[PDB]
mmCIF file of C-alpha atoms in Angstrom:
data_model
loop_
_atom_site.group_PDB
_atom_site.id
_atom_site.type_symbol
_atom_site.label_atom_id
_atom_site.label_comp_id
_atom_site.label_asym_id
_atom_site.label_seq_id
_atom_site.Cartn_x
_atom_site.Cartn_y
_atom_site.Cartn_z
ATOM 1 C CA UNK A 7 -17.882 -5.650 -9.719
ATOM 2 C CA UNK A 8 -17.420 -1.846 -9.672
ATOM 3 C CA UNK A 9 -20.409 -1.189 -7.396
ATOM 4 C CA UNK A 10 -18.082 0.374 -4.795
ATOM 5 C CA UNK A 11 -16.858 3.011 -7.345
ATOM 6 C CA UNK A 12 -18.589 6.287 -6.348
ATOM 7 C CA UNK A 13 -17.406 9.219 -8.492
ATOM 8 C CA UNK A 14 -19.069 11.834 -6.268
ATOM 9 C CA UNK A 15 -16.810 10.772 -3.362
ATOM 10 C CA UNK A 16 -13.609 10.858 -5.441
ATOM 11 C CA UNK A 17 -13.505 14.438 -6.794
ATOM 12 C CA UNK A 18 -10.563 15.331 -4.470
ATOM 13 C CA UNK A 19 -8.487 12.388 -5.684
ATOM 14 C CA UNK A 20 -9.166 11.785 -9.377
ATOM 15 C CA UNK A 21 -6.650 13.736 -11.387
ATOM 16 C CA UNK A 22 -3.849 13.319 -8.848
ATOM 17 C CA UNK A 23 -0.371 12.591 -10.140
ATOM 18 C CA UNK A 24 2.150 11.418 -7.614
ATOM 19 C CA UNK A 25 5.819 10.501 -7.578
ATOM 20 C CA UNK A 26 6.875 8.537 -4.488
ATOM 21 C CA UNK A 27 9.690 6.476 -3.032
ATOM 22 C CA UNK A 28 8.999 3.355 -0.954
ATOM 23 C CA UNK A 29 11.064 2.739 2.174
ATOM 24 C CA UNK A 30 13.085 0.101 0.226
ATOM 25 C CA UNK A 31 14.201 2.854 -2.211
ATOM 26 C CA UNK A 32 11.968 1.879 -5.179
ATOM 27 C CA UNK A 33 10.624 5.000 -6.939
ATOM 28 C CA UNK A 34 7.116 4.842 -8.438
ATOM 29 C CA UNK A 35 4.737 7.237 -10.170
ATOM 30 C CA UNK A 36 0.916 7.021 -10.528
ATOM 31 C CA UNK A 37 -1.702 9.069 -12.334
ATOM 32 C CA UNK A 38 -5.327 8.723 -11.232
ATOM 33 C CA UNK A 39 -6.743 9.302 -14.702
ATOM 34 C CA UNK A 40 -10.421 8.709 -13.852
ATOM 35 C CA UNK A 41 -12.665 7.024 -11.308
ATOM 36 C CA UNK A 42 -11.709 3.550 -12.492
ATOM 37 C CA UNK A 43 -8.380 3.941 -14.231
ATOM 38 C CA UNK A 44 -4.725 4.648 -13.436
ATOM 39 C CA UNK A 45 -1.564 4.918 -15.440
ATOM 40 C CA UNK A 46 1.693 4.149 -13.658
ATOM 41 C CA UNK A 47 5.430 4.260 -14.264
ATOM 42 C CA UNK A 48 8.188 2.591 -12.254
ATOM 43 C CA UNK A 49 11.483 4.482 -12.103
ATOM 44 C CA UNK A 50 13.702 2.175 -10.014
ATOM 45 C CA UNK A 51 13.831 -1.090 -8.095
ATOM 46 C CA UNK A 52 13.091 -4.708 -8.971
ATOM 47 C CA UNK A 53 10.868 -3.726 -11.928
ATOM 48 C CA UNK A 54 12.290 -0.267 -12.803
ATOM 49 C CA UNK A 55 11.503 0.580 -16.375
ATOM 50 C CA UNK A 56 8.013 -0.973 -16.316
ATOM 51 C CA UNK A 57 5.111 1.295 -17.177
ATOM 52 C CA UNK A 58 1.384 0.666 -17.696
ATOM 53 C CA UNK A 59 -1.524 2.672 -19.087
ATOM 54 C CA UNK A 60 -5.296 2.169 -18.653
ATOM 55 C CA UNK A 61 -5.177 -0.162 -15.630
ATOM 56 C CA UNK A 62 -8.691 -0.720 -14.383
ATOM 57 C CA UNK A 63 -8.848 -0.087 -10.618
ATOM 58 C CA UNK A 64 -11.112 0.037 -7.620
ATOM 59 C CA UNK A 65 -10.847 3.504 -6.048
ATOM 60 C CA UNK A 66 -12.553 4.261 -2.733
ATOM 61 C CA UNK A 67 -12.641 7.062 -0.252
ATOM 62 C CA UNK A 68 -11.717 5.855 3.296
ATOM 63 C CA UNK A 69 -11.854 9.280 4.991
ATOM 64 C CA UNK A 70 -11.687 12.891 3.882
ATOM 65 C CA UNK A 71 -7.886 12.542 3.479
ATOM 66 C CA UNK A 72 -7.390 8.858 2.685
ATOM 67 C CA UNK A 73 -8.046 7.045 -0.589
ATOM 68 C CA UNK A 74 -7.472 3.452 -1.624
ATOM 69 C CA UNK A 75 -6.711 1.991 -5.104
ATOM 70 C CA UNK A 76 -6.705 -1.750 -5.657
ATOM 71 C CA UNK A 77 -6.239 -3.827 -8.823
ATOM 72 C CA UNK A 78 -5.392 -7.121 -10.504
ATOM 73 C CA UNK A 79 -2.665 -7.142 -13.187
ATOM 74 C CA UNK A 80 -2.352 -9.313 -16.305
ATOM 75 C CA UNK A 81 0.879 -10.736 -14.857
ATOM 76 C CA UNK A 82 -1.099 -12.160 -11.860
ATOM 77 C CA UNK A 83 0.133 -9.461 -9.497
ATOM 78 C CA UNK A 84 -2.434 -8.004 -7.089
ATOM 79 C CA UNK A 85 -2.037 -4.583 -5.469
ATOM 80 C CA UNK A 86 -3.627 -2.357 -2.908
ATOM 81 C CA UNK A 87 -2.290 1.190 -2.395
ATOM 82 C CA UNK A 88 -3.551 3.768 0.050
ATOM 83 C CA UNK A 89 -2.796 7.484 -0.063
ATOM 84 C CA UNK A 90 -3.047 10.004 2.726
ATOM 85 C CA UNK A 91 -3.234 13.282 0.842
ATOM 86 C CA UNK A 92 -2.800 15.478 3.882
ATOM 87 C CA UNK A 93 0.211 13.584 5.245
ATOM 88 C CA UNK A 94 1.736 13.008 1.761
ATOM 89 C CA UNK A 95 2.213 9.393 2.764
ATOM 90 C CA UNK A 96 1.458 6.355 0.655
ATOM 91 C CA UNK A 97 1.278 2.723 1.652
ATOM 92 C CA UNK A 98 1.422 -0.161 -0.827
ATOM 93 C CA UNK A 99 1.049 -3.903 -0.660
ATOM 94 C CA UNK A 100 2.044 -5.791 -3.795
ATOM 95 C CA UNK A 101 1.619 -9.560 -4.134
ATOM 96 C CA UNK A 102 3.930 -10.760 -6.914
ATOM 97 C CA UNK A 103 3.616 -14.238 -8.489
ATOM 98 C CA UNK A 104 6.766 -16.285 -7.913
ATOM 99 C CA UNK A 105 7.708 -16.122 -11.622
ATOM 100 C CA UNK A 106 8.133 -12.347 -11.351
ATOM 101 C CA UNK A 107 10.269 -12.728 -8.216
ATOM 102 C CA UNK A 108 12.520 -15.154 -10.097
ATOM 103 C CA UNK A 109 12.809 -13.115 -13.311
ATOM 104 C CA UNK A 110 11.402 -9.564 -12.807
ATOM 105 C CA UNK A 111 12.807 -8.121 -16.040
ATOM 106 C CA UNK A 112 10.233 -10.237 -17.901
ATOM 107 C CA UNK A 113 7.685 -7.597 -16.799
ATOM 108 C CA UNK A 114 9.910 -4.584 -17.594
ATOM 109 C CA UNK A 115 8.240 -3.137 -20.671
ATOM 110 C CA UNK A 116 5.429 -0.927 -21.792
ATOM 111 C CA UNK A 117 2.951 -3.562 -20.752
ATOM 112 C CA UNK A 118 0.145 -2.527 -23.122
ATOM 113 C CA UNK A 119 2.243 -3.619 -26.142
ATOM 114 C CA UNK A 120 3.086 -6.990 -24.490
ATOM 115 C CA UNK A 121 -0.267 -8.154 -23.106
ATOM 116 C CA UNK A 122 -0.232 -11.609 -24.684
ATOM 117 C CA UNK A 123 3.356 -12.125 -23.415
ATOM 118 C CA UNK A 124 2.392 -11.166 -19.881
ATOM 119 C CA UNK A 125 -0.597 -13.561 -19.930
ATOM 120 C CA UNK A 126 1.643 -16.387 -21.208
ATOM 121 C CA UNK A 127 4.156 -15.825 -18.414
ATOM 122 C CA UNK A 128 1.337 -15.643 -15.911
ATOM 123 C CA UNK A 129 -0.137 -18.922 -17.186
ATOM 124 C CA UNK A 130 3.177 -20.787 -17.238
ATOM 125 C CA UNK A 131 3.998 -19.812 -13.670
ATOM 126 C CA UNK A 132 5.126 -20.571 -11.108
ATOM 127 C CA UNK A 133 2.578 -18.558 -9.144
ATOM 128 C CA UNK A 134 3.455 -19.463 -5.566
ATOM 129 C CA UNK A 135 4.804 -18.539 -3.169
ATOM 130 C CA UNK A 136 3.954 -14.878 -3.598
ATOM 131 C CA UNK A 137 6.616 -12.293 -2.938
ATOM 132 C CA UNK A 138 4.788 -9.784 -0.776
ATOM 133 C CA UNK A 139 6.115 -6.214 -0.615
ATOM 134 C CA UNK A 140 4.441 -4.045 2.029
ATOM 135 C CA UNK A 141 5.963 -0.616 2.455
ATOM 136 C CA UNK A 142 5.364 3.006 3.275
ATOM 137 C CA UNK A 143 6.420 5.657 0.767
ATOM 138 C CA UNK A 144 7.164 9.332 0.842
ATOM 139 C CA UNK A 145 5.184 11.287 -1.813
ATOM 140 C CA UNK A 146 7.929 13.591 -3.041
ATOM 141 C CA UNK A 147 5.905 15.248 -5.845
ATOM 142 C CA UNK A 148 2.144 15.624 -6.206
ATOM 143 C CA UNK A 149 0.115 17.639 -8.715
ATOM 144 C CA UNK A 150 -3.455 17.828 -9.994
ATOM 145 C CA UNK A 151 -3.686 17.033 -13.693
ATOM 146 C CA UNK A 152 -7.511 16.679 -13.948
ATOM 147 C CA UNK A 153 -9.091 13.604 -15.544
ATOM 148 C CA UNK A 154 -8.254 11.843 -18.810
ATOM 149 C CA UNK A 155 -5.026 13.681 -19.632
ATOM 150 C CA UNK A 156 -3.343 11.197 -21.938
ATOM 151 C CA UNK A 157 0.068 12.910 -21.792
ATOM 152 C CA UNK A 158 0.858 12.489 -18.093
ATOM 153 C CA UNK A 159 2.151 8.938 -18.407
ATOM 154 C CA UNK A 160 2.788 8.331 -22.077
ATOM 155 C CA UNK A 161 6.448 7.325 -22.358
ATOM 156 C CA UNK A 162 9.085 5.107 -20.735
ATOM 157 C CA UNK A 163 10.914 6.463 -17.641
ATOM 158 C CA UNK A 164 14.096 6.668 -19.770
ATOM 159 C CA UNK A 165 12.357 9.038 -22.243
ATOM 160 C CA UNK A 166 11.573 11.834 -19.770
ATOM 161 C CA UNK A 167 13.203 15.284 -19.550
ATOM 162 C CA UNK A 168 16.172 15.475 -17.210
ATOM 163 C CA UNK A 169 15.310 15.619 -13.513
ATOM 164 C CA UNK A 170 11.622 14.678 -14.027
ATOM 165 C CA UNK A 171 11.409 12.121 -11.220
ATOM 166 C CA UNK A 172 13.631 14.200 -8.896
ATOM 167 C CA UNK A 173 11.225 17.154 -8.728
ATOM 168 C CA UNK A 174 10.284 18.179 -5.147
ATOM 169 C CA UNK B 7 9.459 -8.316 5.095
ATOM 170 C CA UNK B 8 7.761 -6.922 8.206
ATOM 171 C CA UNK B 9 9.774 -3.686 8.138
ATOM 172 C CA UNK B 10 6.555 -1.693 7.633
ATOM 173 C CA UNK B 11 5.214 -2.930 10.997
ATOM 174 C CA UNK B 12 5.536 0.016 13.405
ATOM 175 C CA UNK B 13 4.075 -0.720 16.881
ATOM 176 C CA UNK B 14 4.198 2.928 18.009
ATOM 177 C CA UNK B 15 1.869 3.860 15.134
ATOM 178 C CA UNK B 16 -0.629 1.094 15.977
ATOM 179 C CA UNK B 17 -1.449 1.624 19.662
ATOM 180 C CA UNK B 18 -5.034 2.754 18.842
ATOM 181 C CA UNK B 19 -5.688 -0.346 16.752
ATOM 182 C CA UNK B 20 -4.039 -3.417 18.217
ATOM 183 C CA UNK B 21 -6.518 -5.320 20.370
ATOM 184 C CA UNK B 22 -9.580 -4.261 18.326
ATOM 185 C CA UNK B 23 -12.345 -6.825 17.872
ATOM 186 C CA UNK B 24 -14.777 -6.037 15.103
ATOM 187 C CA UNK B 25 -17.912 -7.609 13.707
ATOM 188 C CA UNK B 26 -18.924 -6.144 10.335
ATOM 189 C CA UNK B 27 -21.319 -6.700 7.434
ATOM 190 C CA UNK B 28 -20.250 -5.984 3.848
ATOM 191 C CA UNK B 29 -22.709 -4.213 1.566
ATOM 192 C CA UNK B 30 -23.323 -7.598 -0.169
ATOM 193 C CA UNK B 31 -24.626 -8.925 3.190
ATOM 194 C CA UNK B 32 -21.611 -11.110 4.114
ATOM 195 C CA UNK B 33 -20.895 -10.941 7.892
ATOM 196 C CA UNK B 34 -17.248 -11.156 9.054
ATOM 197 C CA UNK B 35 -15.479 -10.892 12.445
ATOM 198 C CA UNK B 36 -11.768 -9.985 13.059
ATOM 199 C CA UNK B 37 -9.566 -9.749 16.108
ATOM 200 C CA UNK B 38 -6.347 -7.730 15.845
ATOM 201 C CA UNK B 39 -4.473 -9.997 18.242
ATOM 202 C CA UNK B 40 -1.088 -8.233 18.001
ATOM 203 C CA UNK B 41 0.938 -6.008 15.678
ATOM 204 C CA UNK B 42 1.371 -8.784 13.082
ATOM 205 C CA UNK B 43 -1.435 -11.263 13.768
ATOM 206 C CA UNK B 44 -5.206 -11.491 13.313
ATOM 207 C CA UNK B 45 -7.760 -14.158 13.992
ATOM 208 C CA UNK B 46 -10.924 -14.077 11.898
ATOM 209 C CA UNK B 47 -14.281 -15.775 11.656
ATOM 210 C CA UNK B 48 -16.766 -15.679 8.810
ATOM 211 C CA UNK B 49 -20.423 -15.841 9.764
ATOM 212 C CA UNK B 50 -22.292 -15.691 6.465
ATOM 213 C CA UNK B 51 -21.896 -15.371 2.678
ATOM 214 C CA UNK B 52 -19.893 -17.296 0.097
ATOM 215 C CA UNK B 53 -17.492 -18.766 2.697
ATOM 216 C CA UNK B 54 -19.588 -18.588 5.894
ATOM 217 C CA UNK B 55 -18.372 -21.051 8.540
ATOM 218 C CA UNK B 56 -14.668 -20.477 7.773
ATOM 219 C CA UNK B 57 -12.377 -19.427 10.596
ATOM 220 C CA UNK B 58 -8.658 -18.739 10.902
ATOM 221 C CA UNK B 59 -6.323 -18.182 13.847
ATOM 222 C CA UNK B 60 -2.761 -16.760 13.856
ATOM 223 C CA UNK B 61 -2.813 -15.258 10.349
ATOM 224 C CA UNK B 62 0.320 -13.208 9.843
ATOM 225 C CA UNK B 63 -0.568 -9.735 8.562
ATOM 226 C CA UNK B 64 0.881 -6.375 7.610
ATOM 227 C CA UNK B 65 -0.841 -3.710 9.758
ATOM 228 C CA UNK B 66 -0.214 -0.014 9.004
ATOM 229 C CA UNK B 67 -1.611 3.313 10.125
ATOM 230 C CA UNK B 68 -3.031 5.420 7.264
ATOM 231 C CA UNK B 69 -4.316 8.224 9.531
ATOM 232 C CA UNK B 70 -5.310 8.789 13.140
ATOM 233 C CA UNK B 71 -8.612 6.976 12.436
ATOM 234 C CA UNK B 72 -7.778 4.660 9.499
ATOM 235 C CA UNK B 73 -5.743 1.460 9.631
ATOM 236 C CA UNK B 74 -4.909 -1.117 6.962
ATOM 237 C CA UNK B 75 -4.409 -4.909 7.237
ATOM 238 C CA UNK B 76 -3.092 -6.955 4.342
ATOM 239 C CA UNK B 77 -2.204 -10.638 3.952
ATOM 240 C CA UNK B 78 -1.705 -13.669 1.724
ATOM 241 C CA UNK B 79 -3.612 -16.901 2.378
ATOM 242 C CA UNK B 80 -2.594 -20.559 1.794
ATOM 243 C CA UNK B 81 -5.611 -20.777 -0.576
ATOM 244 C CA UNK B 82 -3.964 -18.208 -2.945
ATOM 245 C CA UNK B 83 -6.332 -15.449 -1.831
ATOM 246 C CA UNK B 84 -4.769 -12.007 -1.286
ATOM 247 C CA UNK B 85 -6.567 -9.449 0.943
ATOM 248 C CA UNK B 86 -6.340 -5.823 1.976
ATOM 249 C CA UNK B 87 -8.799 -4.373 4.488
ATOM 250 C CA UNK B 88 -8.964 -0.806 5.774
ATOM 251 C CA UNK B 89 -10.811 0.212 8.937
ATOM 252 C CA UNK B 90 -12.076 3.663 9.729
ATOM 253 C CA UNK B 91 -12.541 3.558 13.503
ATOM 254 C CA UNK B 92 -14.201 6.975 13.742
ATOM 255 C CA UNK B 93 -16.776 6.330 11.013
ATOM 256 C CA UNK B 94 -17.213 2.638 12.013
ATOM 257 C CA UNK B 95 -16.723 1.581 8.419
ATOM 258 C CA UNK B 96 -14.498 -1.045 6.807
ATOM 259 C CA UNK B 97 -13.441 -1.517 3.200
ATOM 260 C CA UNK B 98 -12.147 -4.808 1.838
ATOM 261 C CA UNK B 99 -10.579 -5.901 -1.415
ATOM 262 C CA UNK B 100 -10.364 -9.676 -1.690
ATOM 263 C CA UNK B 101 -8.733 -11.345 -4.703
ATOM 264 C CA UNK B 102 -9.996 -14.899 -4.778
ATOM 265 C CA UNK B 103 -8.453 -17.550 -7.041
ATOM 266 C CA UNK B 104 -10.962 -18.851 -9.600
ATOM 267 C CA UNK B 105 -11.136 -22.255 -7.872
ATOM 268 C CA UNK B 106 -12.648 -20.592 -4.820
ATOM 269 C CA UNK B 107 -15.238 -18.779 -6.965
ATOM 270 C CA UNK B 108 -16.262 -22.127 -8.457
ATOM 271 C CA UNK B 109 -16.342 -24.146 -5.221
ATOM 272 C CA UNK B 110 -16.128 -21.809 -2.183
ATOM 273 C CA UNK B 111 -17.203 -24.430 0.389
ATOM 274 C CA UNK B 112 -13.832 -26.151 -0.113
ATOM 275 C CA UNK B 113 -12.351 -23.368 2.070
ATOM 276 C CA UNK B 114 -15.048 -23.587 4.800
ATOM 277 C CA UNK B 115 -13.149 -25.104 7.718
ATOM 278 C CA UNK B 116 -10.870 -24.285 10.598
ATOM 279 C CA UNK B 117 -8.101 -23.503 8.189
ATOM 280 C CA UNK B 118 -5.184 -24.099 10.594
ATOM 281 C CA UNK B 119 -5.776 -27.880 10.423
ATOM 282 C CA UNK B 120 -6.197 -27.935 6.651
ATOM 283 C CA UNK B 121 -3.131 -26.076 5.378
ATOM 284 C CA UNK B 122 -1.932 -28.887 3.100
ATOM 285 C CA UNK B 123 -5.432 -29.273 1.685
ATOM 286 C CA UNK B 124 -5.779 -25.548 0.991
ATOM 287 C CA UNK B 125 -2.404 -25.528 -0.737
ATOM 288 C CA UNK B 126 -3.361 -28.567 -2.841
ATOM 289 C CA UNK B 127 -6.537 -26.891 -4.042
ATOM 290 C CA UNK B 128 -4.517 -23.740 -4.644
ATOM 291 C CA UNK B 129 -1.913 -25.634 -6.716
ATOM 292 C CA UNK B 130 -4.486 -27.510 -8.796
ATOM 293 C CA UNK B 131 -6.264 -24.329 -9.778
ATOM 294 C CA UNK B 132 -7.795 -22.699 -11.583
ATOM 295 C CA UNK B 133 -6.128 -19.514 -10.378
ATOM 296 C CA UNK B 134 -7.383 -17.061 -12.974
ATOM 297 C CA UNK B 135 -9.401 -15.029 -13.478
ATOM 298 C CA UNK B 136 -9.526 -13.698 -9.932
ATOM 299 C CA UNK B 137 -12.935 -13.011 -8.429
ATOM 300 C CA UNK B 138 -12.376 -9.576 -7.026
ATOM 301 C CA UNK B 139 -14.684 -8.417 -4.265
ATOM 302 C CA UNK B 140 -14.304 -4.721 -3.441
ATOM 303 C CA UNK B 141 -16.882 -3.648 -0.920
ATOM 304 C CA UNK B 142 -17.647 -1.347 1.988
ATOM 305 C CA UNK B 143 -18.926 -2.741 5.284
ATOM 306 C CA UNK B 144 -20.626 -1.368 8.347
ATOM 307 C CA UNK B 145 -18.874 -2.137 11.653
ATOM 308 C CA UNK B 146 -21.789 -3.297 13.795
ATOM 309 C CA UNK B 147 -19.838 -4.200 16.981
ATOM 310 C CA UNK B 148 -16.394 -2.971 18.084
ATOM 311 C CA UNK B 149 -14.531 -3.535 21.358
ATOM 312 C CA UNK B 150 -10.997 -3.444 22.753
ATOM 313 C CA UNK B 151 -9.811 -6.865 23.906
ATOM 314 C CA UNK B 152 -6.074 -5.991 24.346
ATOM 315 C CA UNK B 153 -3.344 -8.123 22.783
ATOM 316 C CA UNK B 154 -2.926 -11.900 22.671
ATOM 317 C CA UNK B 155 -6.322 -12.852 24.105
ATOM 318 C CA UNK B 156 -6.660 -16.434 22.937
ATOM 319 C CA UNK B 157 -10.356 -16.664 23.819
ATOM 320 C CA UNK B 158 -11.779 -14.060 21.445
ATOM 321 C CA UNK B 159 -11.782 -16.278 18.356
ATOM 322 C CA UNK B 160 -11.597 -19.839 19.598
ATOM 323 C CA UNK B 161 -14.549 -21.697 18.092
ATOM 324 C CA UNK B 162 -16.476 -22.191 14.862
ATOM 325 C CA UNK B 163 -19.216 -19.622 14.155
ATOM 326 C CA UNK B 164 -21.869 -22.353 14.623
ATOM 327 C CA UNK B 165 -20.733 -22.959 18.209
ATOM 328 C CA UNK B 166 -21.215 -19.432 19.571
ATOM 329 C CA UNK B 167 -23.958 -18.316 21.978
ATOM 330 C CA UNK B 168 -27.252 -17.645 20.255
ATOM 331 C CA UNK B 169 -27.180 -13.889 19.415
ATOM 332 C CA UNK B 170 -23.377 -13.448 19.468
ATOM 333 C CA UNK B 171 -22.834 -12.094 15.964
ATOM 334 C CA UNK B 172 -25.929 -9.842 16.065
ATOM 335 C CA UNK B 173 -24.764 -7.874 19.132
ATOM 336 C CA UNK B 174 -24.115 -4.185 18.437
ATOM 337 C CA UNK B 175 -22.652 -1.088 19.914
#
């Protein structure tokens, strides 16, 4: 299932830590913690406040500058993000189950402490139709944190020093 | 909902007609019929024989050479493909509902005439866990057909001329 994960091709991407704003104004943050894991933190928008550690992902190199990260969430949401490092442009597609569209705050938590809850909501549904969000984003801040730094994304967006998400 | 669709960014991509084989051996064919539509045709693998016309998609430029196409299916499957035109490689992530993993032939049809059926199977489930296929592919044949050519994908894969899907460039 992770056959396509090729660490040797990902050395320019693993370790990246990006803050970005989608064209709809939602502000997101992702840390590429290793070849198969991300942490992420949502700052604003429909699910602002939600954050997630140790999400297993599929990370591939598309070109020298472009990388893709795709994953399935315990809520039922599926995601594929691409990043163009050179252009500092991200694109995401997010397929939300209908239950999230109807009541998105249900997912606004530190997910890792609410896994059973998320699975229950997922299982109760409804699932369909999906709310599909497909948007470009500007990468406003990007840094290289190296792999397996557990401090990059370790608290809620409300617990960060002033101006954190507004940098660059 | 199609705000990300930017025709000026897609002029090198619209009209492309690709035949490709995933690293697991499954052979797929896609036609980028316009800025928001594909037709596709599966030749082999878990759902070989399936074909689809007029699938609404989100097509975006990632670079000069790399484009992305993403979409939701009436089966519950969600898809995102990226094509690297220069390297003649494709990458797909496909998130199949569990019901498809268990009985994939249920989806082998001209889907456009079986929308209610696909949605029924989708609604009955199971949905979870998803069977996630994340795989590279080699693009074996690529040509420019221009937009809105209704003849490119207009029959089942069984009805094509003998070596059609094996042609290369």
